[PDB]
């Protein structure tokens, strides 16, 4: 019947903004790749997916309900 009234909140999660991604391997010497944190060897990871070093946390987007330390 009736049509909607007026709220004012109108936000979005974030658009997963376009950034320069993969510098999780750091260039030091040739041809070495200097990891700062593990490229996770979970129980289904192929070791082609990194794990976030959050600071205060340890979180993978694939292992997101499991394998999440708080350090």
């Amino acid at each position: 019947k009736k049509s909607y009234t007026t709220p004012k909140k109108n936000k979005h999660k974030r658009k997963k903004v376009k950034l320069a991604v993969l510098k999780y391997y750091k260039v030091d010497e040739n041809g070495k790749i200097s990891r700062l944190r593990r490229e996770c060897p979970s129980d289904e990871c192929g070791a082609g997916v990194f794990m976030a070093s959050h600071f205060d946390r340890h979180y993978c987007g694939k292992c997101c309900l499991t394998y999440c330390f708080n350090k």
Binding site: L22, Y25, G31, I33, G46
Partner: protein, 124 residues
């Protein structure tokens, strides 16, 4: 088979590689492809976004699997794989570079792919 030119040979790879879905486009998939042993071919190209990644791709070839080939001009590889596959005579919505791609066991192994690539690879 082939005429044993590096570019039109790598095209014969790419035909069946498209069907095989061996194409690991973008840095995250490129990294994952060469950190995996399922890759068998790599081609790189000129500065797309950084002069850092062109270095990094060589760094990954060093540590994991040397297989590298360099064919410059991002627009080349960008044309070569469209939205999922090369698409249309035209297509002005995209033609953007893939900048480097990695293909898995020359796509399919069925015919000429093995000989054309093997001729180049042990030399390079």
């Amino acid at each position: 088979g082939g005429v044993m030119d590096v570019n039109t040979a790598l095209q014969e790879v790419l035909k069946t590689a498209l069907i095989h879905d061996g194409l690991a486009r973008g840095i995250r998939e490129a990294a994952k492809a060469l950190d995996k042993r399922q890759a068998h071919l790599c081609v790189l190209a000129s500065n797309c976004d950084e002069p850092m990644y062109v270095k990094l791709v060589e760094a990954l070839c060093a540590e994991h699997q040397i297989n590298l080939i360099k064919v410059d001009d991002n627009k080349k590889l960008g044309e070569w794989v469209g939205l999922c596959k090369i698409d249309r005579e035209g297509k002005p919505r995209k033609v953007v570079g893939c900048s480097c791609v990695v293909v898995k066991d020359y796509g399919k192994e069925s015919q000429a792919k093995d000989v054309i690539e093997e001729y180049f690879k042990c030399k390079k």
